[PDB]
Amino acid sequence: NFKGSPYLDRFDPSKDRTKVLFNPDRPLQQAELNEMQSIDQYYLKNLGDAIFKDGDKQSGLGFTLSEDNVLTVNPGYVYINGKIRYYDNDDSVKITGVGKETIGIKLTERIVTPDEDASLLDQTSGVPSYFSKGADRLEEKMSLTVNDPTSATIYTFMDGDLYIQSTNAEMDKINKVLA
Amino acid sequence: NFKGSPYLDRFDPSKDRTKVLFNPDRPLQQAELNEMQSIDQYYLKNLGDAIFKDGDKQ
Amino acid sequence: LLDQTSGVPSYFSKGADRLEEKMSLTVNDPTSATIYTFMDGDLYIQSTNAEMDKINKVLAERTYDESGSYKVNGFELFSEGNAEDDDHVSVVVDAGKAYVKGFKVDKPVSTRISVPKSYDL
Amino acid sequence: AIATYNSHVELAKYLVSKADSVYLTIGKSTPWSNETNPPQPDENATVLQEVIGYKKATKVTLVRPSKSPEDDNKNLISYGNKSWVEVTPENAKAEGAKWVYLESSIVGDELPLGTYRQVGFVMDLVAKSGISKFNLVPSEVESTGTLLFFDNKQFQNRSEQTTAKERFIVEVDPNS
Amino acid sequence: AIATYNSHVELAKYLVSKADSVYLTIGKSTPWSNETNPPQPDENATVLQEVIGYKKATKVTLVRPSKSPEDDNKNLISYGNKSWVEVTPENAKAEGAKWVYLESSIVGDELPLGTYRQVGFVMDLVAKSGISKFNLVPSEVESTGTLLFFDNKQFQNRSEQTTAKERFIVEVDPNS
Hints:
The structure is cut from a larger assembly and holds three copies of chain A and two copies of chain D. By secondary structure, chain A is α+β, with helices and mostly antiparallel strands. Helix content of chain A is 15%, strand content 30%. In chain A, strand 4 (76-79) and strand 5 (84-87) form a beta hairpin. Chain A starts with 29 loop residues before the first helix and ends with a helix. Chain D contains two helices and 14 strands; from the N terminus they run H-E-E-E-E-E-H-E-E-E-E-E-E-E-E-E. Chain D is globular. Chains in contact: A-B, A-C, B-C, B-D, D-E. The B-D interface holds B 1, 4-6 and D 130-133, 137, 139-140. Strand 8 of chain A pairs antiparallel with strand 1 of chain B, so a sheet runs across the interface. Chains D, E: This is Baseplate protein.
């Protein structure tokens, strides 16, 4: 919710507004700065979505399975939500080992402020002050799930045994053209 | 290296931070501006590196 | 790069720098963006149309999975017997096009080759 | 002819006069063959192995070993299993001060993380244009100057809350 | 901590830069206790015994021992049962030139007569006002400067028609 009071980002895809044209001798709204990157990120998401899909493995993300059904995924590149992300969370989940199980990656948004991360303060001064605090950061960590339908599925298993594969970088629309 | 004193670019791929959220009535930092462009070009680079290679003609 | 906004206090004031990224040619650097390779005074392979590495790696599965490896044209063998060394017989592989284990191969020229003579008794 | 004790003093004075161009350097980020006592440094060389970077010297001065009681109350230093005193350049031939003291500190995230196994001091270092900061990696240096002293050393950590530090006391002649 | 070869070189460069203020000096005009067996030079000595005078250095340069083939077409020097070549200051580190060559001639009657047994080279000498000549007795000098290098010898003698040529090759570190 970046339309809220602290940020007031005015971006909305229906308005078909693609560029922020700054003018001299006027206030520099923080909302304009937020919309400036939101437009680019939205169009980059569109450009990714016309090629890829939520869960498309590019390289790496090798899974492993223990005798105790503990499933562990190594680092790699994957499309999840409008971007190609390097996974390296070193997350693990234990599968039931019965019926269809769909491993997937969930993306969780979180706001990081200078109060939490002290390095976001002003580097030129290098100490806590009235002028030290500035912009916040949006952190998007990735976590591994078992059967959450909202998450981007990366693998599918039946009774612990792997059910579908690709030898190479997944691209949803390229396969629809090839088909 | 843009992390040093003249620019102080604070971007780092491993932190998984994808957006700079500015706040009103605060002193603006040039490092935030540098990171703002650094991010969206980095994800355009990852998007490119999933299709292309550093030796391709178009 | 100096501010040129007319009639403001910041007129002609210094501001942000620019990062300039220019391009030039190099030879046998393994990190370079290889535009061409040349064999013995000629172009080795064709580069006909827009290049996409991962699209060609998606096709590298489907090509052999659909129809295997096959020749399209060319690649005839001709003996020539050139005196490059007295203990060798020289031969030419003609210009041609093929698909091999996932990837297209396309040469605008013949490739020259040789094999050692037989002296075992 | 002999090189006299006071010639070594005047040569120590000269090295101290160069202080504003003096940098610590550290290197050798991969192991030796065994770690307890590495070999002698090959003094024909002019740069460290596996150079990590450079940091501006915090302190450069003449020194001498102290004598009790009267030096025990002065500008005291400890190094090399001996007690020492600071000496200023205009006192050098009265005090006998042929030894040069060199020191710098590295703090937080300012240079690469981990451990190191070589140490040295350079004069006449120059950075690439616009880089005024006192911590420099090898790609930020325009000229490395002259490596004056260097050696092979037992390793220590640096991590997010720990100060790293390096120093020498050095002279022009090991033994006459 | 231990020295380096790069430092011996930069310190020889510094003593060659002083050349304009450099004078030969000779002394010890009465016998040793044993004229076959002189003592060693005690390094803390600031002036020769029985000082005869001073003469401006006719040559001051870096040198290194001569080696074939690369010195077969360079400026040769012969000294002390050894052979040498000249080095310019801006080539000192590349050539390895840690040795300084110092030389002057005291000719005919231009300085006091009789025997001599001590020899050396000073830097930072200054004459009294209005004296511009390069040969000086101790009463024509205003300041003797600093004695960098000196040694003892078995005696030699001058009559009024006869000349003494005196020189040394030196380096900052005598033996290893």
